[PDB]
Design a protein around this ligand. Sequence first.
Ligand SMILES: CC(C)(COP(=O)(O)OP(=O)(O)OC[C@H]1O[C@@H](n2cnc3c(N)ncnc32)[C@H](O)[C@@H]1OP(=O)(O)O)[C@@H](O)C(=O)NCCC(=O)NCCS
Ligand SMILES: CC(C)(COP(=O)(O)OP(=O)(O)OC[C@H]1O[C@@H](n2cnc3c(N)ncnc32)[C@H](O)[C@@H]1OP(=O)(O)O)[C@@H](O)C(=O)NCCC(=O)NCCS
Ligand SMILES: CC(C)(COP(=O)(O)OP(=O)(O)OC[C@H]1O[C@@H](n2cnc3c(N)ncnc32)[C@H](O)[C@@H]1OP(=O)(O)O)[C@@H](O)C(=O)NCCC(=O)NCCS
Ligand SMILES: CC(C)(COP(=O)(O)OP(=O)(O)OC[C@H]1O[C@@H](n2cnc3c(N)ncnc32)[C@H](O)[C@@H]1OP(=O)(O)O)[C@@H](O)C(=O)NCCC(=O)NCCS
Ligand SMILES: [Cl-]
Ligand SMILES: [Cl-]
Ligand SMILES: [Cl-]
Ligand SMILES: [Cl-]
Ligand SMILES: [K+]
Ligand SMILES: [K+]
Ligand SMILES: [K+]
Ligand SMILES: [K+]
Lengths: 393, 393, 391, 391
Amino acid sequence: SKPTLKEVVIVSATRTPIGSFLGSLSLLPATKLGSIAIQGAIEKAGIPKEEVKEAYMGNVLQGGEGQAPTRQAVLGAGLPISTPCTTINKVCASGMKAIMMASQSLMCGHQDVMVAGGMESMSNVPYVMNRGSTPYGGVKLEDLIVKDGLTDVYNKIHMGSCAENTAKKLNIARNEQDAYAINSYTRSKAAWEAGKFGNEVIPVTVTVKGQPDVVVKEDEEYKRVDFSKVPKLKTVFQKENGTVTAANASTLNDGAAALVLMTADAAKRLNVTPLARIVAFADAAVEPIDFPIAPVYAASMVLKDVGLKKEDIAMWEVNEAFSLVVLANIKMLEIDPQKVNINGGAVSLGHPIGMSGARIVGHLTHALKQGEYGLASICNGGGGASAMLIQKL
Amino acid sequence: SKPTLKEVVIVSATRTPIGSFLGSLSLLPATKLGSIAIQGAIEKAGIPKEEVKEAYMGNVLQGGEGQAPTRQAVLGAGLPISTPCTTINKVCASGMKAIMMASQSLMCGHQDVMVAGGMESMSNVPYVMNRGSTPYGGVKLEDLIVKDGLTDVYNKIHMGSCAENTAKKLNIARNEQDAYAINSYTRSKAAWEAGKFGNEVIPVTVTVKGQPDVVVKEDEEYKRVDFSKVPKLKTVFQKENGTVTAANASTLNDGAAALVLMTADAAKRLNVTPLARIVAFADAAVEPIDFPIAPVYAASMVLKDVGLKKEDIAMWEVNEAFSLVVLANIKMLEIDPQKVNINGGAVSLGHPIGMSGARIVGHLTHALKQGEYGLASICNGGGGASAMLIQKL
Amino acid sequence: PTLKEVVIVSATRTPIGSFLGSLSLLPATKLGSIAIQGAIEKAGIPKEEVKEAYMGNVLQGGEGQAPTRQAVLGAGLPISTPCTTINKVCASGMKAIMMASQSLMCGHQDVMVAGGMESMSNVPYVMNRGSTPYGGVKLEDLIVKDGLTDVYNKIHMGSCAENTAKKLNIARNEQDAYAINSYTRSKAAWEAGKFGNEVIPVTVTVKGQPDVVVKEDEEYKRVDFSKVPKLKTVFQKENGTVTAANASTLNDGAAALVLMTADAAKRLNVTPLARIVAFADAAVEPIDFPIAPVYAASMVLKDVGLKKEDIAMWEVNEAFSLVVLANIKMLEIDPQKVNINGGAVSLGHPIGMSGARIVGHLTHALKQGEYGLASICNGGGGASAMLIQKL
Amino acid sequence: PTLKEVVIVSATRTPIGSFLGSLSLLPATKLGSIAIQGAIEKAGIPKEEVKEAYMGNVLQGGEGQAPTRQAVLGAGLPISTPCTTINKVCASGMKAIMMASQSLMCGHQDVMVAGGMESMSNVPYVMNRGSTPYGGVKLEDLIVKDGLTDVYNKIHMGSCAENTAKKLNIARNEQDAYAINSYTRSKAAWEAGKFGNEVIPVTVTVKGQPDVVVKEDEEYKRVDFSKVPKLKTVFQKENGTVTAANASTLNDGAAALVLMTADAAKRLNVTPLARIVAFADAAVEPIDFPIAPVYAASMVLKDVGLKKEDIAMWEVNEAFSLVVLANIKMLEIDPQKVNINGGAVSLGHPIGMSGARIVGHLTHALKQGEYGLASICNGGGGASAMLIQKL
Ligand SMILES: CC(C)(COP(=O)(O)OP(=O)(O)OC[C@H]1O[C@@H](n2cnc3c(N)ncnc32)[C@H](O)[C@@H]1OP(=O)(O)O)[C@@H](O)C(=O)NCCC(=O)NCCS
Ligand SMILES: CC(C)(COP(=O)(O)OP(=O)(O)OC[C@H]1O[C@@H](n2cnc3c(N)ncnc32)[C@H](O)[C@@H]1OP(=O)(O)O)[C@@H](O)C(=O)NCCC(=O)NCCS
Ligand SMILES: CC(C)(COP(=O)(O)OP(=O)(O)OC[C@H]1O[C@@H](n2cnc3c(N)ncnc32)[C@H](O)[C@@H]1OP(=O)(O)O)[C@@H](O)C(=O)NCCC(=O)NCCS
Ligand SMILES: CC(C)(COP(=O)(O)OP(=O)(O)OC[C@H]1O[C@@H](n2cnc3c(N)ncnc32)[C@H](O)[C@@H]1OP(=O)(O)O)[C@@H](O)C(=O)NCCC(=O)NCCS
Ligand SMILES: [Cl-]
Ligand SMILES: [Cl-]
Ligand SMILES: [Cl-]
Ligand SMILES: [Cl-]
Ligand SMILES: [K+]
Ligand SMILES: [K+]
Ligand SMILES: [K+]
Ligand SMILES: [K+]
């Protein structure tokens, strides 16, 4: 027999703008961007801070951040000292997995109101030196972005080289990948200029003693592009017959996102209007080198579970880890390209890894029309993916 | 009314021995200790590896371990590439929180069989250097054990100094703390001598090319003691009227633990006999400085939830972060000290921070007699604690 | 065998670059090659005539094997040229000239190159060999550890200067006035074109960049006189005297001289600039290094029977303004004859280079028949001094 | 004035410690103090008579300001003693003695101390000044970067030796025979008490542990003759000849000599051990450093008018067994007169120390009236050589 569970709703979804690597938000640690997003979400939901019972935040690169990153973000947002906190790491899937795990606690009736999201400051990720005796001939200082973030343990190659493998297998060429990337930048600029993130993004003031304030109000990455340069660029992850470039891959970035989740009962009790219902979610895993196709199986599991067909989905958010990944998913699922990553994605907006899975779910929440279904999927290092289905209320 | 949930059972619980800092297990990465505990747990459960659907592992100090620590542990144990993995960080409570969150997935019917536990190799935790430019005059690279594991963010003091604060408030003196510590070493020795860890601990072979193999078959820490020296030690965190010493505090250590969890239905399908039922669990939080008393509130929450009295508990496992922590809990709960940490604990056995929360649940699993209730609780940095109630089958 | 007479035939230097400034892309050894090549060109002799080379260089860490050999081969000199790198802290550049002169005096060589080189911009940090200690690892800055810290007293060179300021009663306003005078004199000499024969320009070449020609000293323009009396006393909190403005700075540069016996100069028909008359080293209590040049200068004057009045120009290296004032006070010499075209407080102080630079400056600035005396202090309580006569 | 006669009055050294071994707790400067103090005691002169000091020291990074000054003051010599640190790579310790001899020959000092020191155990790693590059960086080992890599060829000293092994047809088996010979001679000489006047013991004090008295060289006992032919060729995978057993090792130690003019020895009632006759430096292509000592030795013989036959004993530094074999072959000398009591392959090679050690050894081992010739190669393609006669 199947358990009888509580219904879970999204009441608010807020994010910081995304900063470029060593760019506009580089002075702020990940936990502080977390505080900003969490306070933003609470404000937008219209509930007292004291109503939030527990918090989960995704965060992939936690080294040097200090004790209990999620607790820092939560206490920094002015939430009660009585609030338990857990920091989640499923690599790039962390921001989505946090929402999923929080949903499961709500479904069990173990809490009635929670905050879940993700945060990352890639600008502030440190280098490491090993503990022990210094070996004769040299001591390595490794970059934790490369070592913990972007290198497949098993193949000993960059995520970008794993992507090249799928480009080979599925015959997805340089020109197709470049066209997708240009498309992403185009959609991001359009959305931003049309005022489409007006309720999703909250601005950030950067203060430096002796300097005038800087107000960061929009995503930084999408303006850093030159369409004429795009087809000229070198293939950085493979010298012989490559396809992936700086322009058609996601970038390194800083940002945080937070959602307020509650049971249908609690939303009634607090007289708040729910934005969306969380219907179903799943995780899938494949051979580590094949992570780009893992979101295909995760999305399929979700559709099969709920009894829906791909054509029933109004809007897809397939995380733009690489242009290659989105094209692979479009090809295998046979879905309408006009319904995928409609207002841009990670290739042009950037990819603070622990945050992105939460951002894309928050974007569907705002963009879907009443009654429509949205499906968000995200690959992660090691061969995994997470996927989530929501319906707009 | 209340949700109707799947019943959750523990089928096996296994661990490596706990190694001392830079000691017998120091050559093995946390992820390798993870693979060993997971393999052991599946062997002891007597089920196909393919039946494990998903895995969660606690792990506090993830810097330099490589991409997706839990995935590394699971694949290194020979589990299917189809197995999704998430790495969990709630400081010292991590190993317990992993079991709790896995239990929640099982209750929702989202998976039927999971592995949960915790892993830490404090010997292999690195130092960090900031990204950017080196200041004129040099820099000190920070030790991540100290910066991420052991320093309160808000007070800017060691966990040990937070403990001194509780010692003051509740009048828990040096002599009482030293007596508790001696008692822990005594109880640990007694338990090993009596063969109380026979089914719980699996040995590990350390192989070094060009030297004989070393078989580690018991915990290393409890033999590193001198009872005569205990009352002579100086107080390491507070010179001015201190109480906490190297002897009466937990140590730095390496180890991993894993539990096979499934629904009661899955156990019947697979023809396995469960060891215990997971009944209830809870998280609590107080002011960061007051973490030593947080386990009191988490334990009370659990008892109230199920409607039991403290007298109903046959065995207590209150993690021995410091001798002070246990005495503080005994004092406030007003429970029988003969029922607390009966076979030793972290003061004498050691404290690989991400694993201890799982170890103590695993020990109750084996030590309890049929029908008895066991309660485990564990404090964590930032002011939190987790607690879990199980019943022997 | 009777001792041979030694002459200076040429003396050349790079401009001095500021810390992390205009010359920071070039290693010390490359600056040394440029200086050496320029000196040989000015001397008007084939490179093959140079028999052996000594270069001063204080902070050799990370420069690679045999720094002087790198400078020499980099300048296109023969593979047969033996090379030695000299370390007497700030006195290194002068000590190299002294030791080369001694080899020439013995008839062991007939033509040598000697000088000094330093790239403080490129001096690395160090980590100790061994087990990493619990709680953290220290990365020390070699400029501070090897260059600027007194071993015995465990204080900065600047704190040693404060000590002398106390004992000899040399005040903050006096040191500030001297520093302003140094900056003023440096600017005046550059504007008068007094370095036209001494300094050679350096071309800095970067990939995908337009070439940059560095033709003058960088440091002397980095000053605000109105701010001088307001600066904090960085080496001492209470009643301090030494500041960033009145102390020498950290810098990059190289200098080189072609030296010959009188017989070799004649054989090659070169016109020598100056004769080397005498030189000496003195040493005192480590903290008292500011006064060691007084004793070294005194030794050289006494050696040749000259009085302080017989000296036309003094170069007392400006380690700190305090040092020059202390020397003037103890020696009782005319300040208008001391560091007349500026010095290390305003031009900068690449430590292994400065003792060569000041001897090379005398060689160009002295008029025929005049005597010049150069002295320079060094960490540990030492000083070197040299007397030359213009030909 | 004519050139003064120079004599060696004493020569003393520490034992040589293995890499990270028995002397690894002591800095190079402390080892220097021990050797300098011993040399002065043995000379029987007041310490105030020593006027100036030069010490060889190749790897100066992290040792603190003015390494020679630290050694001198640590030995209890007066603060009035000027100090200079000398770097000619492996030739440093000899070149220091040569340069001191020139100062004495000129009449500039009458009594000096010269020698060399090195603590390879305490040589640090370096990190470049600047911003850390994306993707990380390896902190270089200064032993490798400054000590043992040829700048121009970008290969290890050991690979340079391979080049000479190929050119002169000196095979693996011949190199292994020479190395076993060195270990055998070292053990025999220690057992015969031949170092009793040369080596002074070192007490290593550690709080909470008993003292350790180091009384003999550590390295020569670390050998297994049956394993020598089984080792891998660590510098060259294909067709190699150089191994860990037949190469010098990395080590800690210091040596110091007291030098005087003949007049000074008379004045002080000192009976000197030997006279310094002549010395020279030679240089060739950097890759060809193994053969430079042939040319330096030939220069000294030619200068003085002696034949190779007139030399009673040769000390050709054992940088590699290959180097010694190449020198014997080109010079055509009796192998029974070469490195008679062992050398660097088995006693070890603290690089700034060895050039001084070998001159000190000849001073003790030669019989009255006999000539000894010492020679030593250095990175960059150099060598130094010196002739002495026993009195
Ligand atoms: C790809 C990556 C290594 C960056 O490469 P990079 O070479 O250091 O990037 P650069 O900025 O130096 O780009 C090099 C060139 O590309 C150009 N370029 C980059 N993006 C461009 C764009 N959008 N439009 C036009 N030109 C662009 C730059 O102008 C530069 O030009 P240049 O060669 O004349 O100097 C890094 O962003 C990365 O690793 N991305 C993948 C992140 C990832 O794996 N995420 C997780 C997914 S699972
Ligand atoms: C306390 C801590 C810093 C270790 O301190 P330390 O001073 O480096 O420990 P040491 O091994 O140097 O021991 C110090 C002295 O105590 C002695 N000692 C240690 N354990 C002993 C024992 N069990 N019995 C008798 N003597 C003991 C040692 O012999 C030593 O004596 P000495 O100085 O005369 O030689 C470290 O274990 C720690 O931080 N523990 C807390 C872990 C923690 O906070 N975990 C999180 C929980 S919230
Ligand atoms: C003194 C020393 C530590 C530099 O100190 P510093 O404080 O880091 O120097 P800075 O460049 O940051 O200068 C600090 C201030 O002084 C000012 N300043 C520096 N030189 C100045 C000048 N010539 N005129 C006016 N102002 C000046 C700067 O503008 C700055 O002002 P701010 O704090 O309002 O911005 C360094 O040059 C040194 O060690 N010198 C001695 C070298 C030495 O000892 N050599 C060996 C001799 S024995
Ligand atoms: C050669 C050098 C790199 C060390 O090599 P290494 O491989 O780290 O040396 P090791 O101590 O690890 O010895 C390797 C093996 O040789 C063996 N070995 C070494 N010396 C031996 C000897 N004298 N007899 C027998 N066996 C010996 C060791 O037992 C070891 O055996 P194993 O592989 O079974 O464990 C280093 O000593 C060096 O660079 N020397 C040259 C110094 C130099 O260039 N000086 C300047 C001259 S210009
Ligand atoms: Cl918490
Ligand atoms: Cl996964
Ligand atoms: Cl000196
Ligand atoms: Cl040379
Ligand atoms: K891009
Ligand atoms: K203990
Ligand atoms: K200045
Ligand atoms: K050897």
